[PDB]
Amino acid sequence: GRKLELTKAEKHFHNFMMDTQLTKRVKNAAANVLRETWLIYKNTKLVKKIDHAKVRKHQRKFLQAIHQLRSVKMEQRKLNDQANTLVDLAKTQLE
Amino acid sequence: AALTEEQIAEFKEAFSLFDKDGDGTITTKELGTVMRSLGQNPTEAELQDMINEVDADGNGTIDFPEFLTMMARKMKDTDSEEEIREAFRVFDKDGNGYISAAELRHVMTNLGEKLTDEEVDEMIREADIDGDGQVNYEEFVQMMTA
Ligand SMILES: O=C1Nc2c(ccc(Cl)c2Cl)/C1=N/O
Numbered sequence: 104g105r106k107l108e109l110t111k112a113e114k115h116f117h118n119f120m121m122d123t124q125l126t127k128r129v130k131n132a133a134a135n136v137l138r139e140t141w142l143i144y145k146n147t148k149l150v151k152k153i154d155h156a157k158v159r160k161h162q163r164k165f166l167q168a169i170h171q172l173r174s175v176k177m178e179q180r181k182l183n184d185q186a187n188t189l190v191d192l193a194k195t196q197l198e
Numbered sequence: 199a200a201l202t203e204e205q206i207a208e209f210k211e212a213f214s215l216f217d218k219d220g221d222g223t224i225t226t227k228e229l230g231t232v233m234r235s236l237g238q239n240p241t242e243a244e245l246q247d248m249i250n251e252v253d254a255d256g257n258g259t260i261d262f263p264e265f266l267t268m269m270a271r272k273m274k275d276t277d278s279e280e281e282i283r284e285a286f287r288v289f290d291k292d293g294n295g296y297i298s299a300a301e302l303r304h305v306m307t308n309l310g311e312k313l314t315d316e317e318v319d320e321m322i323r324e325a326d327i328d329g330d331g332q333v334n335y336e337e338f339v340q341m342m343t344a
């Protein structure tokens with residue numbers, strides 16, 4: 104039988120977005136990653152006059168959006184393993 | 199994502215592990231119960247999200263058709279050798295890839311669900327391949343997963 108094998112974990116974002124709330128979280132945080140990447144680039148590379156306070160504001164907004172994205176990714180990883188736990192328990196009835 | 203008919207009858211028996219009342223649907227309440235009996239603590243939102251990933255019709259609960267259907271999307275397995283080796287490393291104090299037989303007996307008879315000293319004997323008979331009172335657990339795990 105299966106011996107010591109367990110369900111293989113999945114690959115990418117291609118699931119669990121049916122929870123529109125994570126979807127709302129992903130789409131807002133990713134727009135903000137785009138937003139603050141642009142504004143940091145502009146305020147450091149497309150100006151003669153680097154306004155450090157402006158860069159600080161957008162660095163704080165940037166780290167916020169990145170870690171929001173990280174946080175959604177870890178909750179997807181957690182949901183998949185919770186699901187793989189049920190699939191693994193079910194699968195012991197094949198023994 | 200398409201498997202055998204024998205497994206259909208098998209997954210039906212699995213379904214009763216989940217349908218704690220036998221009403222033909224899995225609710226979040228029963229899924230919380232089952233998940234907690236496996237040593238996990240999912241939030242109410244995590245339970246609603248697992249049901250909603252399966253829930254074909256939208257009635258908030260999983261039936262065997264929806265249960266069987268998501269089983270096929272998750273049929274592939276992978277070997278567990280590296281995960282088992284890291285469980286052994288937890289007890290590798292020196293980080294040298296060894297755990298003494300005495301240390302292994304102490305762990306197996308004091309932590310988790312435990313083993314009898316007789317059960318531990320058989321285990322160490324197999325684990326100490328070189329008979330030197332030290333378990334090279336990567337070797338021992340490769341022997342058990344081969
Ligand atoms: O995205 C998934 N949702 C799932 C999976 C596997 C099993 C179960 Cl019960 C659910 Cl609700 C998934 N595998 O990717």
Ligand SMILES: [Ca+2]
Pocket residue numbers: 217218219220221222223224225228
């Ligand atoms: Ca039920």
Ligand SMILES: [Ca+2]
Pocket residue numbers: 253254255256257258259260261264
């Ligand atoms: Ca249903």
